[PDB]
Amino acid sequence: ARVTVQDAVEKIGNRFDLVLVAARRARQMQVGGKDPLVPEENDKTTVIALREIEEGLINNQILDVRERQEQQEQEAAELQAVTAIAEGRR
Amino acid sequence: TLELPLDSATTESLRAATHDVLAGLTAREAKVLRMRFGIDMNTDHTLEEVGKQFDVTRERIRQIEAKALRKLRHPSRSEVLRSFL
Amino acid sequence: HARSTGSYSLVTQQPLGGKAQFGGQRFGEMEVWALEAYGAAYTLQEMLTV
Amino acid sequence: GQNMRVAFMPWNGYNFEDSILVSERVVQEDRFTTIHIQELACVSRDTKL
Amino acid sequence: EEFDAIKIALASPDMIRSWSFGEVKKPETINYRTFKPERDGLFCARIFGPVKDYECLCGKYKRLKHRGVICEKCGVEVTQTKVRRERMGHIELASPTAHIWFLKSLPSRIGLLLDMPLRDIERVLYFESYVVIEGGMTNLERQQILTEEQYLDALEEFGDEFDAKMGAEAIQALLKSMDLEQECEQLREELNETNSETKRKKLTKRIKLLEAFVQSGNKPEWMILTVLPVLPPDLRPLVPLDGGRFATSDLNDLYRRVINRNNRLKRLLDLAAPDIIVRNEKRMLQEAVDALLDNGRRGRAITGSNKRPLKSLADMIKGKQGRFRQNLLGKRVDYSGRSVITVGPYLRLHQCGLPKKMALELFKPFIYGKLELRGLATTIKAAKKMVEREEAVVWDILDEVIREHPVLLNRAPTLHRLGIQAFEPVLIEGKAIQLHPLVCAAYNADFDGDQMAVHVPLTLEAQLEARALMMSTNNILSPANGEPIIVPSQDVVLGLYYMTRDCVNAKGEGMVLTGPKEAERLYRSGLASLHARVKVRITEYEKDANGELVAKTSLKDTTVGRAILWMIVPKGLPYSIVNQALGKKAISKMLNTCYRILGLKPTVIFADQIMYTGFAYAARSGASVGIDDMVIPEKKHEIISEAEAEVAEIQEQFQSGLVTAGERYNKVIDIWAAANDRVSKAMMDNLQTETVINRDGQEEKQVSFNSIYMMADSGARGSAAQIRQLAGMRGLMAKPDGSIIETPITANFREGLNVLQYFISTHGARKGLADTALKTANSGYLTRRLVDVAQDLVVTEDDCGTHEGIMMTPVIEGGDVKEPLRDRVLGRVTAEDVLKPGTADILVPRNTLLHEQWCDLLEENSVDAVKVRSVVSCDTDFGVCAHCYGRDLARGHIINKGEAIGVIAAQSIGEPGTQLTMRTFHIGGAASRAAAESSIQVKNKGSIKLSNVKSVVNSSGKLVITSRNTELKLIDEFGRTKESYKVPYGAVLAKGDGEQVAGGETVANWDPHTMPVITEVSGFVRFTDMIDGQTITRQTDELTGLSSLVVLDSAERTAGGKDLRPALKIVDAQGNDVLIPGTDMPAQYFLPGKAIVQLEDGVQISSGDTLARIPQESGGTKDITGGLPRVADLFEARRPKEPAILAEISGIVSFGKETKGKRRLVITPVDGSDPYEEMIPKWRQLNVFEGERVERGDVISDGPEAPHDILRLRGVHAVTRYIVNEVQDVYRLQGVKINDKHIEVIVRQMLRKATIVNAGSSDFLEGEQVEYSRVKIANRELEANGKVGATYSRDLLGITKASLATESFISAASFQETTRVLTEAAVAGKRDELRGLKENVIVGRLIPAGTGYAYHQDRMRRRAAGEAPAAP
DNA sequence: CGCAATAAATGTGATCTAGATCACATTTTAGGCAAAAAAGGCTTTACACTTTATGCTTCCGGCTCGTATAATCGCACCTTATGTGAGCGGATAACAAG
DNA sequence: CTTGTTATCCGCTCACAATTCCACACTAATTACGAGCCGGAAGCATAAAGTGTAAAGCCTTTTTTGCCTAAAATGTGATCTAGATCACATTTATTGCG
Secondary structure, three states: OOOOOOOOHHHHHHHOOHHOOOOOOOHHHOOOOOOOOOOOOOOOOOEOOOOOOOOOOOOOOOOOOOOOOOOOOOOOOHHHHHHOOOOOOO | OOHHHHHHHHOOOOOOHHHHHHOOOHHHHHHHHHHHHHHHOOOOOOHHHOOOOOOOOOOOOOOOEEEHHOOOOOOOOOOOOOOOO | EEEEOOOOOOOOEEOOOOOOOOOEEEHHHHHHHHHHOOOHHHHHOOOOOO | OOOOOOOOOOOOOOOOOOOOOOOOOHHHHOOOOOOOOOOOOOOOOOOOO | OOOEEEEOOOOHHHHHHHOOOOOOOOOOOOOOOOOOOOOOOOHHHHOOOOOOOOOOOOOOOOOOOOOOOOOOOOOOOOOOOOOOOOOOOOOOOOOEEEOOOOOOOOOOOOOHOOOOOOOOOOOOOOOOOOOEEEOOOOOOOOOOEEEEEHOOOOOOOOOOOOOOOOOOOOOHHHHHHHHHHEEEHHHOOOOOOOOOOOOOHHHHHOOOHHHHHHHHHOOOOOOEEEOOOOOOOOOOOOOOOOOOOOOOOHHHHHHHHHHHHHHHHHHOOOOOOOOOHHHHHHHHHHHHHHHHOOOOOOHHHHEOOEEEEEEEEHHHHHHOOOOOOOOOOOOOOOOOEEEEEEOOOOOOEEEEOOOHHHHHHHHHHHHHHHHHHOOOOOHHHHHOOOOOOOOOOOOHHHOOOOOOEEEEOOOOOOOOOOOOOEEEEEOOOEEEEOOOOOOOHOOOOOOOOOOEEEEOOOOOHHHHHHHOOOOOOOOOOOOOOOOEEEOOOOOOHHHHHHHOOOOOOOOOOOOOOOOOOOOOOOOOOHHHHHHOOOOOOOOOOOOOOOOEEOOOOOOEOOOOOOOOOOOOOHHHHHOOOOOOOOOOOOOHHHHHHOOOOOOOOOOHHHHHHHOOOOOOOOOOOOOOOOOOOOOOOOOOOOHHHHHHHHOOOHHHHHOOOOOOOOOOOOOOOOOOOOOHHHHHHHOOOOOOOOOOOOOOOOOOOOOOOEEEEEEEEHHOOOOOHHHHHHHOOOOOOOOOOOOOOOOOOEEEEEEEOHHHHHHOOOHHHHHHHHOOOOOHHHHOOOOOHHHHHHHOOOOOOOOOOOOOOEOOOOOOOOOOOOOOOOHHHHOOOOOOOOOOOOOOOOOOOOOOOOOHHHHHHEEEEEEOOEEEEEOOOOOOOOOOOOOOOOOOOOOEEEEOOOOOOOHHHHOOOOOOHHHOOOOOOOOOEEEEEEEOOOEEEEOOOEEEOOOOOOOOOOOOOOOOOOOOOOOOEEOOOOOOOOOOOOOOOOEEEOOOOOOEOOOOEEOOOOOOOOEEEEEEOOHHHEEEEEOOOOOOOOOOOOOOOOOOOOEOOOOOOOOOOOOOOEEEEEEOOOOOOOEEOOOOOEEEOOOOOOOOOOOOOOEOOOOOEEEEOOOOOOOOOOOOOOOOOOOOHHOOOOOOOOOOOOOOOEOOOOOOOOOOOOOOOOOEEEOOOOOOOOOOOOOOOOOOOOOOOOOOOOOOOOOOOOOOHHOOOOOOOOHHHHHHHHHHHHHHHHHHOOOOOHOOOOHHHHHHHOOOOOOOOOOOOOOOOOOOOOOOOHHHHHOOOOOOOOOOOOOOOOOHHHOOOOOOOHHHHOOOOOHHHHHHHHHHHHEEEOOHHHHHHHHOOOOOOOOOOOOOOOOOOOOOHHOOOOOO
16 A cells, blocks of 8 residues: 555544644645755655655654644744745746 | 636746846946836936936937847847737 | 646636647536545535636 | 457456457558548638738 | 625615616617727726726727826726626616515515515506505505596595505505504514414514514615616627627616616606506516516516527526526536546556556646756746647656656446545556456446546645545445445456365265375365475475465364465464355455454555455466357256146146136246246256366356356356356246246257247347336435535534433334344443343443444343433534444444544435335236245244133134234243244134144144134124125035125125115124223124125124134235335425324224224224224224234334324434334345444434424424423423423424525525525524535535534644744 | 785886987967957937828718508418426315304 | 304416536528718828937947067987886785684
């Protein structure tokens, strides 16, 4: 099947939870660049192509979870505020 | 009247990048056209443009513009003027 | 047949299919409830808007 | 149609459901060639231009 | 960003005047010359804005220099072409006109509040001259009309002023001249003074509506539209098509007409015309206005040229031209592909193949995103000219661009959810989509030329969900039952059944060390199993050799094939498989237990080696076909011999004249239809003895395979019916009508069928593709009702607040009569601590789950009530927690927060519907079903014991019976019933109570050919007006020879013989008819036709003698049906097509017959007061016998039962269990298994409403949530102490109607009846919140459930990884 | 002090190029400075732009008026025949109460 | 006997079609005309102040060209010491072992 996928649903007593754990955060990593990701480059997927590795994926960040934190409206309020992101050419 | 997503990214990059490479050109001829309608309003004043740069007369009012036109060929990857028609 | 980009209407504003360009598979309602059963979210609102 | 030989015997999975493999020698003799033919036409107009 | 709540309120001319800029008077549209709109026309730019970007219509401002400045000559601002779809206009109507959305929308809103009823006055005045009163002289009526004949007579004398007025002119002046404050109190005092039928009937809708106008900031005089907004030109464009022509909408015509309707009634009729024509005109205006707003309500509008239903406004809006249901629901995907489907052995269980070229087309916007980052391209535009349409196309990063981007394979139709699964796309050379062979069982499709489309997720969020639940490696088990849906097909099972093959047929057990040694045949403990012992499993095969293998620290005697797959299982998880031929069914129970303890990974790995060794040995079989391979069983000539014996005696008796052609027309079928079934069974019996590797078949392609037996036993493909047409006979066909061919067609395809015998074989071949043309249509109609209602039935939290007492106690006395099942208790945490008999420490914890093994202990000794948290016993507002439910079924754990048990439960019972719907035809008129059993016998040993039996000595000399509830059971040493039987009425017993019997011995034998009639009491015989040759005559039998008096029917009687009813009454010693204590009805035992008697007038008869006997026949409509119409009966709470009247008062059973069938009151229960009596057709089958303590609500007859009938007593905890289990009955006979917890979630929805019986001070329409029995019923003396008691009653409405009376207005609007809810919520102003499901799909926002719910959206996993915790 | 064994270090000396010399006469090198050929400079004169007042003419364009006219009326012939059940108000017959 | 409300019945207006993609091919009838009228524009040349274009008329600045020749870089080859070169034969010194 896939790598470390059935291990994330057995470690915690829920499946629908793991979804947003690697959803509202994963899609947020791209719209925020890549700097917000402070963990080491160890927890990262591997893509075999041209004798090198690219992309990034996820499902390898879920380790230190918690109950109550932030609401749900600020997730994309101060995120797109600190970093605007765009696309320019020479 | 409503551009599709296909050319939506093309038309956007064809009207906001020329004024960047325009600075890299002879100050005199470039500043005449740029600092006239691009920063202000209305172009071609003749007896007023002669006192805007404080130099020549009303002859180069047509020459400078023409000399500049052929210089607009420079912006290849960047474009702005080629869209109005 | 396969379509990725094409023309769109005015008041309707939906994917069509001309001659040179292909046609887009209309996501029938029959495939909507089958998705709601899983209890998804974002993958349901996308097949309605953008 | 026509008549061909056949070694009636399954082929390791490749022939699952109504799946059939065909020898390359049959293609070499191009015995299965069908001409479709379409229809194109150019019309001149009296445009205002 | 997003949308929250929506506010709705009436529209006022003051508000519409704001958006509008002017009024249109000129019907003229635009010009064909300069293509410029006309001034003050329909498409005028003065009000609707400019036509082109930053430019007027004349030509005063063209250049972009003018950011936005109005013209002094034109009067038009300078804006873009987008502001055209916004803003509106109006039209000053000289003549007032009531709206249509507030007139036909009962209750009325423009007349009801004006004292006007609803139709008997506010519809006739609109037509011809009907002068109605609107004011009043001195205390008059406000409903009475006025005839024109009495009009000219009420002007001068005899009358006063009389405020006369026409039609539409008299409706707006009233609204402005009325006080809601005073008028409200005028009708409030009229609810007890007069009867509730003459006035109050209507007044009930007076206080309700008015109350809304007061609470909200509205006003009665807003329903009248003095002006009418104009639809934006963007919704009604006008752009030239091709050829210098144009294109306009027909809707525009509805504007050029209304103009001529008003201007005409201004300077022509309202000051010139007498009156006999001015009225007609005013009638046309109102009809021309309500037609534009909504056409189809009243007086459909027709355009000029070419008729056709003219389009209006409301019609095009919601789409009423299709009756709503067939709405425009369907959004075309911008990215999709489609091609031919093929196979791919190289693929895996979680992999799928796809065309090469298709990869570039689909992921087009994505492939360019990677080419720029690489070296292949540096600009998206430059790369666009690369892979255009030339010979420059070259492979590159196409391999890496598609690695972790799963795709959804959609193969319509799609019943459940397995129709849409996710697999990791892999590039493969070809123009077809290769699909996994093992997953073909889910898509139920063959590779004969089908077609399937594929979707591709764009957002990353969906990409994650595609590997969470959309993937196939996680959906192995079945949501419905729990058994693995994915199982070996044809080839993968063939390779396994081949390697795992023995020979059986052993002798016994012996030393055996030398001599035998025959291949790898099956044996107890001998052969090479002891001679060849090897420690390691490696060195064993090679030259084909078996012996002793070490597995699970034990000694066993199997071959290399019996431990080739059974050794790879312990590799991950150790188990134990019983020594049996591994087949398609054997693996089913294996995968199940390989998922109970562990997750999903350790189980999917086992499904890898199964495929590899599935196509390997399936290629070295060497199976073929020959002319002598179609051998025929010798048992065929053994079953025909006994058949010929009957055939050689069927024409012989026909030539004589004693047997009609019809008698032998239905006898030939009852001998050949059973001769073609035994031949197939006798064949397979031989293909499993001396040889099994036998090869048959022919030479074609489908899905079967050679070896006609090897594939039929492996469970691959090949039914006994199909095989019969190869080695057996042809069978029996059927006539186009319904009969069956006389002469059979034994001639097989081997010898060749005759020309005549082949002519009949074409008749029965037409019944094949004629009985499945309904199930293939759309069996998803069942799920079409549940989803559109239980869309809000989703888990809301983990723990509500309920205790353990008030819940649901699933009794063991349920079903039709008493047929319990583990299904109900299957997966549900217990509540109270049930004290079960036994030793100490045996009680069950009041906080533990329920497993399949844990339930086996409950339904073994308890047999009592078991307190357990159910779904309908939840104490929350809309939703059901995880504890109240149970298992997930989809996996092997408790339901997680987010499981939509309201949607999945609808599809779990909707998909099996493609296997139901049987019979539903007519072969010769079915009156009943089937039955058997003539004599009973005991196989064991014990003693005969009878319960409630009354046996005496009959005058005939037989041991008849008086009771009707006896039973023949065996009493064990413990006094427990081992077996039970049923003894028909009027049966003779050989032995009495207390007799000892043995094994294999008859204890009873009756005569199922006649139903004797015995009295219950004593008395003297008295023939009731039955004269011989006038009502009853003798009729001897040609068989028995015994003559008996047969009474004729009532319809066979003469003119005076019908007025007399045959009967046998009994009296005492005075001549008075005996009266039955309790019921109080005469003891007259009537005797209908076809009844024989052997008694004489004036004889002694005791309680037990047979007065007569009535030969039973066959009646009763088919109450055993299954499919869609059956399910759509109890759900919609509709009255079943199989009525079953149920009593209302409990008591005791007291039988009572009558000439015109049974009477009484469906077994009228006798109490201690006053019984009741009614009537019911004889088309009712008896179920409950005498001596039964039955209450109200309990099914008395058979089949379905009126939900509203039992609602009076059962309540909730009882009426729910019935409807849930009743549906599980039709799916019980089919064979499919489904948990009843999928119904307990949709039935609870019908428990949201509860009508109130006792009023007191309230009305009668009241009825909300039932979760308020702690204040409503308590509001009498304790709660608020108002001394106003008010009892209520539960209400079980239909499923569809359940979601109709929803607080939300958009809810019922998205389903049935939408024109009503949009007017009821506009007056009061309901601020509906996004809480439902379909209420979101229409607006566009994150789903208010499933993954994102209020209880789940609390916790996350962001905090910017440590850069946002200090941000809130 | 002697012994072991895989790597690094040793000599040979005739053969055949590789790298170096010199002081003076020839041949190359560098940037230098005007001239010619080219860039834009900043003049002063040759002409050309659409625009817009206008009014006069013919041709094509777009709109109405009144007049003249008969009528305010009449057969025989060709081919089909919507689907239902559910929800609703109104008209009629059977019923108990006065 | 007469009256009322109520239940059942009918015809009526009323609300109300949901299995899922694509390809090929094909398609429209009718208001009386003629003479007289005012309408727009056919695009005509006109003419002016105003504007922006388009010849090339000497100035000044840049840039390639050919130029001169003062001073520095460049072969002549036969002889001669300090340098280099190979292969793979045999001899040498390194740290320990025993």
